Amino acid sequence: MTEYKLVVVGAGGVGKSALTIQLIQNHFVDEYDPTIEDSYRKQVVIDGETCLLDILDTAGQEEASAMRDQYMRTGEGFLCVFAINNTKSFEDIHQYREQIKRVKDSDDVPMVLVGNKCDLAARTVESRQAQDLARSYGIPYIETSAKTRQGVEDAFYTLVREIRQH
Amino acid sequence: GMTEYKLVVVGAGGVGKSALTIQLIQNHFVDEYDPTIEDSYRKQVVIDGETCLLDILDTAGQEEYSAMRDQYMRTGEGFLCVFAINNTKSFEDIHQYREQIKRVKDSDDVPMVLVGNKCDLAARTVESRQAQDLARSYGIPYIETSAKTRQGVEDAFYTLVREIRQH
Amino acid sequence: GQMRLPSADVYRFAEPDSEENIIFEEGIPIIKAGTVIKLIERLTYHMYADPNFVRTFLTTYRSFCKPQELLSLIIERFEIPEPEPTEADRIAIENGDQPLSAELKRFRKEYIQPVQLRVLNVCRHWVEHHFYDFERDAYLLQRMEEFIGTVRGKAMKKWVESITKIIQRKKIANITFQSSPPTVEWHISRPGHIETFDLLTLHPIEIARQLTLLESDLYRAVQPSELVGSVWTKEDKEINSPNLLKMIRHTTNLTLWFEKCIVETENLEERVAVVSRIIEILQVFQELNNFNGVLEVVSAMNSSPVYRLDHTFEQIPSRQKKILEEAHELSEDHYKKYLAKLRSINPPCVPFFGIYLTNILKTEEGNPEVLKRHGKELINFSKRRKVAEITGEIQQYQNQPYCLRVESDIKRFFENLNPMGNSMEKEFTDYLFNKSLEIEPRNPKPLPRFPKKYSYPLKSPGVRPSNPR
Ligand SMILES: Cc1cc(Cn2c(N3CCNCC3)nc3c(-c4c(C)n[nH]c4C)cc(Cl)cc32)cc(C)c1F
Ligand SMILES: Nc1nc2c(ncn2[C@@H]2O[C@H](COP(=O)(O)OP(=O)(O)NP(=O)(O)O)[C@@H](O)[C@H]2O)c(=O)[nH]1
Ligand SMILES: [Mg+2]
Ligand code: NA
């Protein structure tokens, strides 16, 4: 069993915790309880190989913005999450991307761009704009709903594949 | 090459039974243990000048899985039947453990030893004469052990191996 | 340079690390032993978060610190004094200017705010995942509510207001799938006819599915509070470990029910059909990763009453002997193949709990509570980490739900199974063994014949599922 250290990052309220708990427990959390730092484990077979995912669920609130280096040092791959009905959260993505690159001193960190809340009709970030950003980073873009499970396994397991081929 | 003996520890739970195998297999002189470690229950020893390998099954903590006792006991060539010297009920349980071993092994003469274990400083309630009389009525040895000082621990396992060798 | 700290005389958590108060294992450090003050300092450390350590500590701390004392210590940790103005600040103020307060601002940003947030994270995890401390001590809950509800100042405000709501919700206290569950399967017994339910009349696929749902729910209900301190082995086990004991007693009852079905079927041909059906149920347990169920069957087939039934064994098809052999091999060599298989499958699964129980008990019994160093007694934290590695593994397999539909009547049938009736254990297991001797006597006694007891067909419908439109 290979172990993978995944970290979920992004602005407050975009659904990082709901995505993680949907993956871990198959349950959608309706409450908005701001995270400080949570960690989960999941044994799962991906492309025929069993592994153990360690998933760090991080704080999006700006009051925690000075406490990120310590978790970025430990992570092997990052889910960069925004919400497709929150343009500010999409604009915050590049700040996370640049900080991860600085801390890990690398232009080649495994990452997936995630546009969450795709069950909602009132989109304000178009898929094309997010896909253009992902291409500029060299990473895939996956739209998800923590509520319906759409794309959730695809987002996390695509990140595992990135780490595996790194 | 060397003979391997499959030994099984049986007895009431909650009264320090596990200290017997832990103290044996332990780094005798460093009080520490990881039971998850592959072969934390195998020990090469020299008994009466003959080297052998002890494989010890101690399912301490699983006593409530009472329908698994046959499954576990079937694996054994010799048995340590353990009670606590401050717990009379654990001593009264010994008769049924022995009957169950005889049934699983389909034999009236299964290698076994009776072990009285001192697991704390609470008052002894089973006197050594009572336990000696019980062991003699069964035709088996009696060994007393301390769960804290390692006294008697080697004697209990080595006596059982001698019972197997002389069967 | 490093930030200066409050005087250790006014704030106990600023004492320097030394081997008299903390010992590390040989990229965050791993603690071997320490004083409770040093453990709490590192639990809430300003330089990094340690979510594993938070879980380990909150799972195991009651072996070295009372809940009321833990709360007092983390409140003490939270209340960090701010440094006085520096010389440059002094000179600015003397000239009527605003000080830069560079050192004060850095200490707030890089020491106070991270430590305070990490104290609140301990409180949040304590309330969310270890709420039994508060269920059992209403005054502890009052103190926690008061502490959280009186934290002032805007940096912590979002988490303070959230933790207040979480506590209130916990006081008064849904699954979605990648696909649809398969259709419930029926054999001789038809829906709603619970009076006919039995080993051979229910569909063997559906027996295995419904027992797996039941056994999964029993597995998922066991909390770490039932395990730490080896409390399921002690005199108050019924109070402290009720979900674990319910789970074990179900497993024991099913094993005994399998044995009873076998030895109370006195006709040889019918008893062969009974054993064959049980091995088919075992095959579906394997397909579902229900290892508890696999071992329930293996334990029955290795029991003294069943193991000796050579005439029954002789008629079991070779393929079914092979299925039983490979199931038995999981338990050989101290469960070597079981442990490897558990770590290789794709959950959901139902682990066998007994191995975890033995490893927790032996870890507790085989390691000292304290280490003595330089005249001081330090808490042996490595021992607690080992226990929490086991409880963590248990929890990891409790997350994944089975995509199987409940059948309420079949569920009730297995919940109410009571093979021993009003008999005591020794009386009942002697009865099973005497039945074994009756139906297949010891050589050289001749093998008798017995009349059939089942009026319905014995042919199995098999264990491959069906799918109508
Ligand atoms: C199939 C079957 C098995 C048994 C009891 N039993 C026997 N018996 C062989 C013959 N003599 C008595 C003992 N072998 C086993 C095995 C095993 C192993 C190891 N290797 N190959 C096999 C098959 C596994 C288990 Cl769990 C129980 C076993 C009783 C009945 C009624 C029955 F139908
Ligand atoms: N409709 C919909 N709502 C969602 C989705 N994901 C999250 N939410 C909702 O958005 C809110 C915030 O979710 P949460 O998971 O707490 O966000 P977060 O990114 O973890 N926040 P923080 O950074 O503060 O920890 C919750 O009310 C949650 O139910 C989604 O896919 N669809
Ligand atoms: Mg969150
Ligand atoms: Na007593």
Provide the residue ranges of all domains of chain A, joining segments of one domain with +: 1-166
Was B111 annotated as part of a binding site?
Answer: no
C341 touches chain A (CB under 8 A): no
Q: Pocket around ligand 2: residues whose beta carbon is below 6 Å from it?
A: A 12-18, 29-30, 32, 34-35, 59-61, 116-117, 119-120, 145-147
Interface of C with A in 369-398 (CB under 8 A): 392, 396-397
Structure determined by:
X-ray
C238 touches chain B (CB under 8 A): no
Whole-angstrom distance between the N-terminal and C-terminal Cα of chain A? 17
Nearest CA to ligand 1 atom 17: C325
- Within 8 A of A37 by CB-CB distance, chain C residues are 49, 51, 121
Q: Do B126 and B43 contact (CB within 8 A), yes or no?
A: no
Q: Which chains touch C (3 or more CB pairs under 8 A)?
A: A, B
**DSSP assignment, residue C10?**
T
- Within 8 A of C298 by CB-CB distance, chain B residues are 71
Taking the C-alpha atoms of residue A57 and residue C444, their distance in angstroms, rounded to an integer, is 70
User: Hey, what are C290's tokens?
Assistant: 């229900």
Was B31 annotated as part of a binding site?
Answer: yes
In the block, residue with structure tokens 């089973």:
B126
How far is the CA of C195 from the CAs of C190, C261, C409, C412, in angstroms?
10, 17, 10, 12
Determine the distance separating the centroid of ligand 1 and the alpha carbon of B76, expressed in angstroms: 17
Name beta bridge partners: C345: none
Task: Identify the sign of the CA torsion C22, C27, C28, C30.
Answer: negative
Q: Which chains touch A (3 or more CB pairs under 8 A)?
A: C
Q: Do B33 and C366 contact (CB within 8 A), yes or no?
A: yes
C316 touches chain B (CB under 8 A): no
Determine the distance separating the centroid of ligand 1 and the alpha carbon of B119, expressed in angstroms: 39
C192 touches chain B (CB under 8 A): no
Give the amino acid at C453: K
C109, C117, C396 ranked by CB distance to A41: nearest: C396
Q: Do C350 and C292 contact (CB within 8 A), yes or no?
A: yes
Q: Do B124 and B161 contact (CB within 8 A), yes or no?
A: no
Chains C and A touch (3+ CB pairs under 8 A): yes
Give the amino acid at C468: P
Smallest Cα distance from C290 to chain B, Å: 17
Taking the C-alpha atoms of residue A29 and residue A146, their distance in angstroms, rounded to an integer, is 8
For C191-238, give the DSSP string. Answer: TT-GGG--TTTS-HHHHHHHHHHHHHHHHHT--GGGTGGGGGGSTTHH
| Residue B43 dihedral angles phi and psi, to the nearest 5° | -150, 125
Determine the distance separating the centroid of ligand 2 and the alpha carbon of A146, expressed in angstroms: 8
**Using the beta-carbon criterion (under 8 Å), do C363 and B103 form an inter-chain contact?**
no
Other beta carbons within 10 angstroms of residue B80's beta carbon come to: 26
Name the nearest CA neighbour of B81 among B133, B37, B130, B17: B17
How far is the CA of C103 from the CAs of A18, C5, C96, C153, in angstroms?
39, 11, 20, 20
Could you tell which of A9, A14, A30, A61 is best to mutate to test the pocket of ligand 2, judged by most ligand atoms within 8 Å of the CB? A14
Determine the distance separating the centroid of ligand 1 and the alpha carbon of C309, expressed in angstroms: 9
**Using the beta-carbon criterion (under 8 Å), do A37 and C51 form an inter-chain contact?**
yes
Query: CA torsion C335→C340→C342→C345, rounded to 10°?
Result: -150
Name the nearest CA neighbour of B125 among B89, B94, B87, B91: B87
For chain B, give the DSSP string. Answer: --EEEEEEEEE-SSSSTTHHHHHHHS-TTS----TTSTTSSEEEEEETTEEEEEEEEE-TT-TT-GGGHHHHHTT-SEEEEEEETT-HHHHHTHHHHHHHHHHHHT-S---EEEEEEE-SSSPP-S-HHHHHHHHHHHT--EEEEETTT-TTHHHHHHHHHHHHHT-
Taking the C-alpha atoms of residue A148 and residue A28, their distance in angstroms, rounded to an integer, is 8
Cβ-Cβ contacts under 8 Å for C341 (sequence gap 6 or more): C291, C330
Smallest Cα distance from C364 to chain A, Å: 24
Note the CATH architecture for domain C182-353+397-466.
Orthogonal Bundle (1.10)
**DSSP assignment, residue C110?**
I
**Taking CA atoms, what residue in C is nearest to A62?**
C155
Taking the C-alpha atoms of residue C196 and residue C194, their distance in angstroms, rounded to an integer, is 5
Task: Identify the sign of the CA torsion A152, A154, A157, A158.
Answer: negative
Residue-level length of chain A: 166
Taking the C-alpha atoms of residue C290 and residue C287, their distance in angstroms, rounded to an integer, is 8
Nearest CA to ligand 1 atom 21: C325
Q: Do C233 and B63 contact (CB within 8 A), yes or no?
A: yes
Note the CATH architecture for domain C4-171+354-396.
Up-down Bundle (1.20)
Interface of C with B in 5-44 (CB under 8 A): none
Q: Do B144 and B67 contact (CB within 8 A), yes or no?
A: no
C343 touches chain A (CB under 8 A): yes
| C351 prior amide bond cis, ω within 30 | no
* H helical segments located in chain A: 16-25, 69-74, 87-91, 93-104, 127-137, 152-165
Q: Where are the domains of chain C?
A: 4-171+354-396, 182-353+397-466
Domain at A1-166, CATH homologous superfamily: P-loop containing nucleotide triphosphate hydrolases (3.40.50.300)
Classify each residue of C329-351 as buried b or exposed e, where b means 16 or more C-beta atoms within 10 Å of its C-beta.
ebbeebbeebbebbeeeebbbbb
Domain B1-167 listed as CATH 3.40.50.150 = no
